[PDB]
Amino acid sequence: AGGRALIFNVKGEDLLFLDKPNARMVEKEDKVVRAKGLSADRYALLGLPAEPFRDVQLLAPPRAGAAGTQRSEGVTPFVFTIREFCARRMLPYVFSDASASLNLGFVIGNIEEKLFRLAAAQISYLEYKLLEERFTRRLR
Amino acid sequence: ADAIGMVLGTEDVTPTVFWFAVSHGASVGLDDLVVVETRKPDGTPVRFYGLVDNVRKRHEGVTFESDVEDVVAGLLPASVSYAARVLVTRVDPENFIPPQPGDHVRHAAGRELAMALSADKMEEAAFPGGLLADGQPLPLNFRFINGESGGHINISGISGVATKTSYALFLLHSIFRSGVMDRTAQGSGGRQSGTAGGRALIFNVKGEDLLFLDKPNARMVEKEDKVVRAKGLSADRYALLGLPAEPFRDVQLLAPPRAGAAGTQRSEGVTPFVFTIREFCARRMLPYVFSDASASLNLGFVIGNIEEKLFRLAAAQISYLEYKLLEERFTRRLRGVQKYLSPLIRGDLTPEQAEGYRPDPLRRGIQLTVVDIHALSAHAQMFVVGVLLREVFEYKERVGRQDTVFVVLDELNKYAPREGDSPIKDVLLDIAERGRSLGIILIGAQQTASEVERRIVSNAAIRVVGRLDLAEAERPEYRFLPQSFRGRAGILQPGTMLVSQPDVPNPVLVNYPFPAWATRR
Amino acid sequence: ADAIGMVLGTEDVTPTVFWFAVSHGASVGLDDLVVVETRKPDGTPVRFYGLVDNVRKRHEGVTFESDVEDVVAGLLPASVSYAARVLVTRVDPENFIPPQPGDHVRHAAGRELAMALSADKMEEAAFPGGLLADGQPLPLNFRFINGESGGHINISGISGVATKTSYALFLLHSIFRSGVMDRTAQGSGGRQSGTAGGRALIFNVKGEDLLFLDKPNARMVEKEDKVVRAKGLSADRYALLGLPAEPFRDVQLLAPPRAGAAGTQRSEGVTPFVFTIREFCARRMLPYVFSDASASLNLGFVIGNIEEKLFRLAAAQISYLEYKLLEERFTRRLRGVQKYLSPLIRGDLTPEQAEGYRPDPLRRGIQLTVVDIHALSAHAQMFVVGVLLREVFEYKERVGRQDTVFVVLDELNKYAPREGDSPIKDVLLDIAERGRSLGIILIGAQQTASEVERRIVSNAAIRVVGRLDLAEAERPEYRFLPQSFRGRAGILQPGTMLVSQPDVPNPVLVNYPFPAWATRR
């Protein structure tokens, strides 16, 4: 029973304070239940205890961690690596668009085979190196 | 047998469809076959055979609805008017006249049942494969299942609740035990296929439920006895069908070597199957390793050329072949696919001097073969299926037909999808095209019958549907279902199917005897 | 022909369709054409020719739904009304005056039937191709079948239960034995066709059921008597139809030499055929070995380039040829097709000296030519038919028509599928577009009439459907069938077919008499 959940959000930070509980919705939940008419609390009726989510880690980029800390209690900052990104052989996600213009996908294929060979022989700096290597302008 | 009721006259009694009433007595359900006697004025009798599909009641004597409904319970003159519709199957003589409104209608249970289901037309080969509401087996034309007249089997329905794989095993059990092949063999007259060497090949991608096809089931004894007394029948359903309760005969369970060692979920009888690297290269059948459609770029070209170079080198003569590919060579995606198979495909390719580890189906003595590929991943499962189907197809092609072999594929949609353009799609397409001439027949299980190629479903002859989705009954692929059956399609509980045959104008219902082979644990 | 009823006036009696009530006595069934006579005010009588297409009976005199049937059976005065729909086909004079209600209606079988089936416009060429309900032979038009007015024969329906080939043989049997070839010969006036020497060609992909055409059948005598007595007829069907009951005049048989020795399944006189390899290259029939579309890549370019070089070599001057072709050289798929084709054809391509072993269709005196090619594979199935069709087509193109050649195909959907662009498909299209000018006439057999390419069935004159399935009963290609007949297509049984020909507005239901030539054993 090792169920693990990975959640992605793009709107406001109402989906931020999952760990902390709250009591202001208890009153309105008690208000709606008496108007509709039920035996007991909805959570108790369903059999699910009203305890909130178990204390779970939450992560934000380090630059946003300084700017936003909206929660300053605790956030684990995730940091990638330029070397480890190259070893993944998997760049094209920076081109999240359709990339159906000309041979942009082919060009990504050309550099990626070329790049990992340099990695196997072992972003501003990488962009400078990529620019110095040679649709190209739109790629850059 | 006393008549159930009387034929109505207020509604039209057109020979195609006619309403009829039921007198106070035996109840009338849906999809029950009845026969009515008609006496022409000249003197020649006529009989109409048909099945009911629409039934209704109406409260006559009350005008204002729900204002006197309670009054009828206490004190009011009111009664009921029970009626139903009949869709005629065929007429005993060849003439279309309306039945006379005022003659009795009775059920067909003896010989009259036989003409209703065209049993006289299919007499020598009457293969039972289903049971109606009462104790009457449903005859299936075996001449359509095999290549004598052509046809295949296509089972469709919603995945999960509708027991799809249970019907394929039941038909396989009934064919191999009712002696249908033995009967058709006689009167050969130098026929092309005059041997009762029927063999079945089946693949399981679900859990180990299908693996235990040898041991008999014990919980079925109490479960079957429970339903038979609740519904009410003379004896056990196996007794009504006319087949023994024993499980299948000798079966070989081919499994990958490493997975078999870690399996134990069976440990009594397992025989590993391994392909030799030298033979695999000599087999030339490389493109089955790329499970995806390979539509990106022109991967079809590079796959051919690398095999073109590889076959010539091997003819003149796991990860080792991959290592040599790097020295000699989108091409990196080809390596990426090969590397992914390495932890899973290694068991199927190991260089050893042992020879009796080839798959080699269709042995000297065998009836049903089970190949367990549950442990293999989706890409690995594609490679095993591709090789075995092509291998048996070529071996069966070199020699004459000389027997009949049935192959069962689960989840036919992902194996052969539309615009699949895959080396597995054409093998299934070729089986669906050259199957009748040879002794190979495809029994496929599909969920929607709308995401597979139209060529495969068109060549099928026997079609089975169970608990069809509401959104799928309106599709053009299910036009063979009349209007009165679309609404009831979703109502069908598990353990009940609609069986459709050529020479039967309308489909009818079938039931299930609970399987006697082991399925749990 | 006594009066059968009165023209009902309660419903609209517009000249297109009008109901009529049948009096007690002579019953009326579906597809029984009737004639109505009406007196115009001036004095000119008017007659209507039409066939019924809907019948119904109404128990007039009650109003409660299914509440008085028990009362009707026991004690109640009531009567039933027999009314039948009539749809007209043509009027006697060239005017549209609705019939006077209260007229007398009668079904006619004498001269009056001739105007019903448009027999006035076709007198010298009358062709009986079927029987009606009474002792009535339905006259087809031979002008449409041959090239006098252009047209082909198209037979469709569900394979198996519908005996398509049996009706096709009946048409061929009736053409030769009715003198229709002779009647058109008289009064030729120097026309292109002045010979009553019609020849036929037959293929058989199925078993040996199409071989004992010369041997008369004895079991047909007793089974014809049984069916004719139960139905009720004046005399035997063949005597009534005007066709002699003798079987086909003895015709030769062609099978590959190795298969002929292996099969025997007839050990009597069989003439084998062998194609010379030297003639094979000289006459340029290379691409027909590829029985597939070959759309992928440019294999067609490879075949054309190789064949052009091959023909030059043959002009300048089979297992070894494959080795020689492989020595010179898309490569393996070329070789792989030949390797598949080799085992069943290398016994048909041999270098020898005897020259009389050429199959030679359309010989000096011959009527039928059965080409026993059942044992060959699908790739070899499509090669032998293609080369044989090119041989007759070129001979009939170099020389004037001066004859009539009937070619009979079986299960034509896969021979010329849609968008296949196979080399054989080009041959079949050539026969369809330009077949009217020459003596070559196609009699095809199909399954759904939608898989076949549209131009094949576009020019077809006579269309025949038998037990059309519910799925394809509403496709656009089956729109010629009136919507009142789609409810009776499924009911149709073997031994009964629907025939539709130009100049007849509505389809007519016919039954074909049982064959006089044995098929089994």
In the block, residue with structure tokens 């050329």: B305
The number of angstroms, rounded, from the C-alpha of B40 to the middle of its chain's C-alpha atoms is: 43
In the block, residue with structure tokens 């094949």: C456
Whole-number Å distance between alpha carbons of B302 and C37: 80
Say whether residue C40 is in contact with chain B using an 8 A CB cutoff.
no
**Residue numbers in C near B398 (CB within 8 A):** 343
Which residue from B250, B253, B286, B256 is spatially nearest to B273, judged by alpha carbons?
Answer: B256
B410 is in an annotated binding site: yes
How far apart are the CA of B329 and the nearest CA of chain A, in angstroms? 13
How far apart are the CA of C450 and the nearest CA of chain B, in angstroms? 11
Whole-number Å distance between alpha carbons of C405 and C394: 13
**What proportions of chain B, in percent to the nearest 5, are helix, strand and coil?**
30, 20, 45
Answer whether B373's CB lies under 8 Å from B381's CB: yes
Record: contact C378-B16, CB cut-off 8 A: no
Say whether residue B515 is in contact with chain C using an 8 A CB cutoff.
no
**Residue numbers in C near B23 (CB within 8 A):** 69-70
- Packing angle, helices B331-345 and B319-328, rounded to 10: 170
Say whether residue A20 is in contact with chain B using an 8 A CB cutoff.
no
Neighbours of B400 (CB within 10 A): 13
Element counts in chain A: helices (H) and strands (E) = 7, 2
Answer whether C451's CB lies under 8 Å from C418's CB: yes
**Residue numbers in A near B330 (CB within 8 A):** 109
B449 backbone φψ class: left, alpha, beta (φ>0; ψ -120 to 50): left
Question: Is B342 strand, coil or helix?
Answer: helix
Answer whether B213's CB lies under 8 Å from B368's CB: yes
The full length of chain C comes to 521
Record: contact C232-B100, CB cut-off 8 A: no
Which residue from B422, B256, B220 is spatially nearest to B346, judged by alpha carbons?
Answer: B256
Whole-number Å distance between alpha carbons of A52 and A67: 28
C513 is in an annotated binding site: yes
Whole-number Å distance between alpha carbons of C405 and C198: 6
Three-state DSSP string of B242-264: CCCCCCCCCEEEEECHHHHHHHC
Two tokens, residue C366: 């011959």
Whole-number Å distance between alpha carbons of C259 and C380: 13
**Residue numbers in B near A110 (CB within 8 A):** none
Mutate to test the interface with B, among C56, C67, C69, C228 (most CBs of B within 10 A): C69
Record: contact A89-B330, CB cut-off 8 A: no
Q: After which residues is chain A broken (C to N over 2.5 A)?
A: 69, 122, 134
The full length of chain A comes to 140
C410 is in an annotated binding site: yes
Instruction: Give the one of C27, C57, C58 whose C-beta lies nearest to B40's C-beta.
Output: C27
How far apart are the CA of A50 and the nearest CA of chain B, in angstroms? 33
B264 is in an annotated binding site: no
Record: contact B97-C490, CB cut-off 8 A: no
Say whether residue C337 is in contact with chain B using an 8 A CB cutoff.
no
Record: contact B434-C65, CB cut-off 8 A: no
Say whether residue C469 is in contact with chain B using an 8 A CB cutoff.
yes
- End-to-end Cα separation, chain B, in angstroms: 48
Whole-number Å distance between alpha carbons of B463 and B164: 12
**Residue numbers in C near B96 (CB within 8 A):** 29-31, 55, 488
Whole-number Å distance between alpha carbons of B293 and B21: 58
Three-state DSSP string of C170-203: HHHHHHHHCCHHHHHHCCCCCCCCCCCCCEEEEE
CA angle B177, B181, B185 (to 5 degrees): 150
| Chains in contact with B, counting 3 or more C-beta pairs less than 8 Å apart as contact | A, C
Two tokens, residue C460: 């077809």
Question: Which helix (DSSP H) or strand (DSSP E) does residue C489 occupy?
Answer: helix C486-489
DSSP string, B466-480: ES--TTTTTSGGGTT
Residue C494: closest CA among chain B residues belongs to which residue?
B503
B164 is in an annotated binding site: yes
Whole-number Å distance between alpha carbons of B82 and B26: 12
Neighbours of C344 (CB within 10 A): 20
In the block, residue with structure tokens 């108007």: A35
How far apart are the CA of C72 and the nearest CA of chain B, in angstroms? 8
Answer whether B154's CB lies under 8 Å from B449's CB: yes
Whole-number Å distance between alpha carbons of C361 and C406: 12
Answer whether B344's CB lies under 8 Å from B337's CB: no
> What resolution (Å)?
3.8
Question: Which helix (DSSP H) or strand (DSSP E) does residue B126 occupy?
Answer: strand B126-131
Which residue from C366, C392, C359 is spatially nearest to C198, judged by alpha carbons?
Answer: C366
CA distances from B275 to A108, B387, C218 (A): 38, 10, 58
Report how many Cβ contacts below 8 Å link chain B to chain C: 144
H helix intervals, C97-217: 111-116, 142-145, 164-177, 180-185
Answer whether B100's CB lies under 8 Å from B38's CB: yes
C160 is in an annotated binding site: yes
Tell me, what amino acid is at B494? Answer: P
Whole-number Å distance between alpha carbons of C49 and C505: 12
**Residue numbers in A near B332 (CB within 8 A):** 89, 112-113
Whole-number Å distance between alpha carbons of C241 and C232: 15
Say whether residue A127 is in contact with chain B using an 8 A CB cutoff.
no
CA distances from C232 to B44, B94, C235, C514 (A): 10, 11, 9, 16
Mutate to test the interface with A, among B326, B332, B339, B340 (most CBs of A within 10 A): B332
Whole-number Å distance between alpha carbons of C292 and C424: 10
Which residue from C272, C270, C330, C279 is spatially nearest to C305, judged by alpha carbons?
Answer: C330
Tell me, what amino acid is at A114? Answer: K
Say whether residue B340 is in contact with chain A using an 8 A CB cutoff.
no
How far apart are the CA of B327 and the nearest CA of chain A, in angstroms? 15
Whole-number Å distance between alpha carbons of B284 and C520: 44
C103 is in an annotated binding site: no
Residue A117: closest CA among chain B residues belongs to which residue?
B332
DSSP string, C363-429: -SS-S--EEE-TTS-HHHHHHHHHHHHHHHHHHHHHS---S-EEEE-SSTTTTSBTT---HHHHHHH
Contact partners, residue C172, CB within 8 Å, separation at least 6:
C200, C368, C406, C408, C443
- End-to-end Cα separation, chain A, in angstroms: 46
A touches C, CB cut-off 8 Å, minimum 3 pairs: no
CA distances from B215 to A92, B212, B372, B517, C398 (A): 54, 6, 17, 6, 72
Residue C184 has φ and ψ, to the nearest 5°, of -70, -25
Say whether residue C488 is in contact with chain B using an 8 A CB cutoff.
yes
Task: List the determination method.
Answer: cryo-EM
Two tokens, residue B96: 């279309």
CA angle C390, C396, C401 (to 5 degrees): 155
CA dihedral angle for residue C489, residue C494, residue C495, residue C499, rounded to 10 degrees: 30
Two tokens, residue C217: 């059948």
Looking at residue B99, the DSSP 8-state letter turns out to be: P
Report how many Cβ contacts below 8 Å link chain A to chain B: 5
Question: Is B459 strand, coil or helix?
Answer: helix
Record: contact B60-C64, CB cut-off 8 A: yes
